[PDB]
Design a binder for this molecule. Structure first.
Ligand code: HEM
Ligand code: HEM
Ligand SMILES: Cc1cc(N)nc2cc(CNCCc3ccc(C#N)cc3)ccc12
Ligand SMILES: Cc1cc(N)nc2cc(CNCCc3ccc(C#N)cc3)ccc12
Ligand SMILES: C[C@H](O)[C@H](O)[C@H]1CNc2nc(N)[nH]c(=O)c2N1
Ligand SMILES: C[C@H](O)[C@H](O)[C@H]1CNc2nc(N)[nH]c(=O)c2N1
Ligand SMILES: [Zn+2]
Lengths: 407, 411
């Protein structure tokens, strides 16, 4: 019941008690581990509100206080009256920061307490939503000195009045299928790109076309808006040894900002809550560029390097993968756009784990996701045992809106 | 109940029914996943269902389920259990069990080979010298002058747990580690404790960086004895790089035959505490883990220096760049010397095909993603993108305590 985790590189052992707080289910059982699977009312409301307010008030050292009890009463009466309830600014902020703190798949969590929270709960329209997002994008980009942020739109009421951002990320490249069967641009976004065009977007049918926003307010039909280009900071990718590398014509955007996740705090549901930090290099260089069902550039890069691509055992893919990732880090650092290499990030995460075990009794973590997609065992996290469990408040996945939308 | 797994690179979806056969436990609960945890005397009471389950499987595989030979075999084993409190496997059953323990090994990426396994029956062995002889022949057969052949040698099963056969080495062939007065480590740091034991047991250590350890062998629960593997039986490979001529001056070599000797093989409830088995290496085992783990030979810096990389900032990925060249060297050296090895691309790709075949013919293939994915270049191999389901099937290979912590010393 008191679980131990070991680092096999250092023999450091930590004890985890925090997991006993866990409420939600993992997908695993005593008979089967699903660790590698990607996606495994009034009466419901109050214990959830109660659990949350308890931890919030414990966090501010007023557990078992009148203020605590009063708030518990006040919310309790509001749930009886209104069915739902509203979070105070303080509780909103706490909840958001803790949703991040509890995100077991995020390696960058040492930053969790330094998060700018934009309260967009006064929003009523998609234009409103567009304005709020533009401000988010500008604030977070900060001329390249990125700052973590989340913008939070009104909470769910009856599911028929949901606020949704339809994009998977605020900034992402379009995906176009071709008559010759191939794929131009980002294959991951082929489908959403269609939905834009189906709804009016005039694609430039390019390779690196910044998608338009598709915003849904109050459950209404979603609308298109183009983010001012001047707010979309991008980085041309060059290599610091290979001068042919620029002719590959690659670039990426600096702001990683997820917009399709659901934020849950004290039983309340925020279906529209875009959040952003800054990139770890491998996200772009390894996954975005080298994944086969993505930009898939390994071959062409290997050819330009004139590598023996006859046999897998030359490890040509491995050589190229490194170089590509060198270039990404190089390009971002040169243009002074914040980025972190997989070595620095995982090192930081170990320190964070140790802080969390010491000051919280543990830190939920998904090794499958925390270990970078390259050079796994030369990063410290590979040798680090982790316990995965679900803490609330949380970020959760949610269905794509187009499958659900009563037009 | 049916369980679906998805490959996110191909959209290929597979349905698992085999997990329904799984009896043993994972460590996980509906409230916690322990999938990255490394490690999460039997009565006649609990022995027959295990025998029966096994024999039911065995006879199904040979399409004689419910046959008279099946039924008589069940009766025979039952009687033998209640009479003697244990039972002996037929050669056929033993072989079947060994192969299936490998088939069921969810942490093994090399399982496409599971049906080609040379089984050596050493259940007639009685002494440590007898074990030495058996182990020598295994090494010679499995090495096959570089054309490696998978093999397992099976010593007598446990009885009361007081007459256990154990091989004290973690692998049949492994390099010594020596801790020095200055705190530094000569040789393989992973083997310092075991090395110390051998020395205490009378082993005269050369004290070099690549000394093949002596065998420390325990028969019938007696104190273990030291033996030296004839050097001519130990195939080794000097590591060089196809482009970098300074690489040979690093002075690295490794042994050709990976053979684990500290695991336990369970078959129909029977426990085989000494069952060394060997296959051949995937390149990254040496090039990534053995050479480049900080707690092992830890050669990254020296290598990156010789390549003259920018080692002042990690953002150069000097470590990543060095790691690749070393792995290229290991592959290149083995291939040049015609010693069987497989790169991590070939092996993961074969495993996907194996896995798919197993879903079709068997209804599943239990797999440990955390272990299946190679320790470099993870997502450019197809297993990274493959959802897997992990669960325990018998027959199986299990971990067991190190004998030095449990052994009762005779003198
Ligand atoms: C500030 C620097 C940050 C870094 C370096 C970072 C790093 C990462 C990485 C590498 C992943 C894996 C993503 C993938 O492979 O698709 C991830 C996932 C995630 N991050 Fe962080 N992140 C940062 C900021 C944030 C912030 C500000 C939040 C929320 C307020 C957050 C919450 C999450 C969540 C919920 C996931 C899981 C996403 C999913 O399951 O799809 N991160 N992060
Ligand atoms: C023939 C070529 C083979 C290859 C390429 C191969 C590959 C591998 C690799 C890379 C690992 C990971 C080990 C580690 O990272 O320490 C492993 C583990 C394992 N293999 Fe295989 N293997 C082969 C043959 C065999 C054979 C013949 C057996 C048994 C008869 C076997 C059973 C196992 C078991 C039980 C593990 C888990 C080890 C543990 O949990 O400590 N393998 N294999
Ligand atoms: C805050 C944040 C920071 C950062 N550096 N990177 C970040 C990356 C993400 C991206 N997570 C996407 C994970 C995913 C989800 C669904 C599918 C599918 N199909 C495939 C992959 C989100 C947030 C990030
Ligand atoms: C058949 C086999 C083949 C092959 N190519 N490689 C193989 C490697 C192994 C190696 N397993 C090592 C597992 C382990 C467990 C604990 C610790 C510690 N501390 C360190 C390592 C076993 C069998 C192999
Ligand atoms: C099958 C497997 O679960 C899947 O490919 C996971 C593996 N680990 C990952 N890790 C991160 N950071 N991001 C991912 O998308 C994935 N994908
Ligand atoms: C903590 C973690 O489980 C540990 O480092 C594991 C990870 N995956 C592994 N995978 C393989 N093949 N071999 C290993 O030794 C390990 N070690
Ligand atoms: Zn699990």
């Amino acid at each position: 019941r008191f679980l131990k985790v070991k680092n096999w590189e250092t023999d450091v052992v930590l004890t985890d008690t925090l997991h006993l707080k866990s409420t939600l289910e993992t997908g695993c059982t005593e008979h089967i581990c699903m660790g590698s699977i990607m996606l495994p009312t009034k009466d419901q409301l109050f214990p959830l509100a109660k659990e949350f307010l308890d931890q919030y008030y414990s966090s501010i050292k007023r557990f078992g206080s009148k203020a605590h009890m009063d708030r518990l009463e006040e919310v309790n009466k509001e749930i009886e009256s209104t069915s739902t309830y509203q979070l105070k600014d303080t509780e909103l902020i706490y909840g958001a920061k803790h949703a991040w703190r509890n995100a077991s798949r995020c390696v960058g969590r040492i930053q969790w307490s330094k998060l700018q929270v934009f309260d967009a709960r006064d929003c009523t329209t998609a234009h409103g939503m567009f304005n709020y997002i533009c401000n988010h994008v500008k604030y977070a980009t900060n001329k390249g000195n990125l700052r973590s942020a989340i913008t939070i739109f009104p909470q769910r009421t009856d599911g028929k009045h949901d606020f949704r951002v339809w994009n998977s990320q605020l900034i992402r490249y379009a995906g176009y299928k071709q008559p010759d069967g191939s794929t131009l641009g980002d294959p991951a976004n082929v489908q959403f790109t269609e939905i834009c065009i189906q709804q009016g977007w005039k694609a430039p049918r390019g390779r690196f076309d910044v998608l338009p926003l598709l915003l849904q307010a109050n459950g209404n039909d979603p609308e298109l808006f183009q983010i001012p280009p001047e707010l979309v900071l991008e980085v041309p990718i060059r290599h610091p040894k290979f001068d042919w590398f620029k002719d590959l014509g690659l670039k990426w955007y600096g702001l990683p900002a997820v917009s399709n996740m659901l934020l849950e705090i004290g039983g309340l549901e925020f279906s529209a809550c875009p959040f952003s930090g800054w990139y770890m290099g491998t996200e772009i260089g390894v996954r975005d560029y080298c994944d086969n069902s993505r930009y898939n550039i390994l071959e062409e890069v290997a050819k330009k390097m004139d590598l023996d691509m006859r046999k897998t055992s030359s490890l040509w893919k491995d050589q190229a993968l490194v170089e590509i990732n060198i270039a990404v880090l190089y390009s971002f650092q040169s243009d002074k756009v914040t980025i972190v290499d997989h070595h620095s990030a995982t090192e930081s995460f170990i320190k964070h784990m140790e802080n969390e075990y010491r000051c919280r009794g543990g830190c939920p973590a998904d090794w499958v996701w925390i270990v970078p997609p390259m050079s796994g065992s030369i990063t410290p996290v590979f040798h680090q045992e982790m316990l995965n469990y679900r803490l609330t408040p949380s970020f959760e996945y949610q269905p794509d809106p187009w499958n659900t939308h009563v037009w």
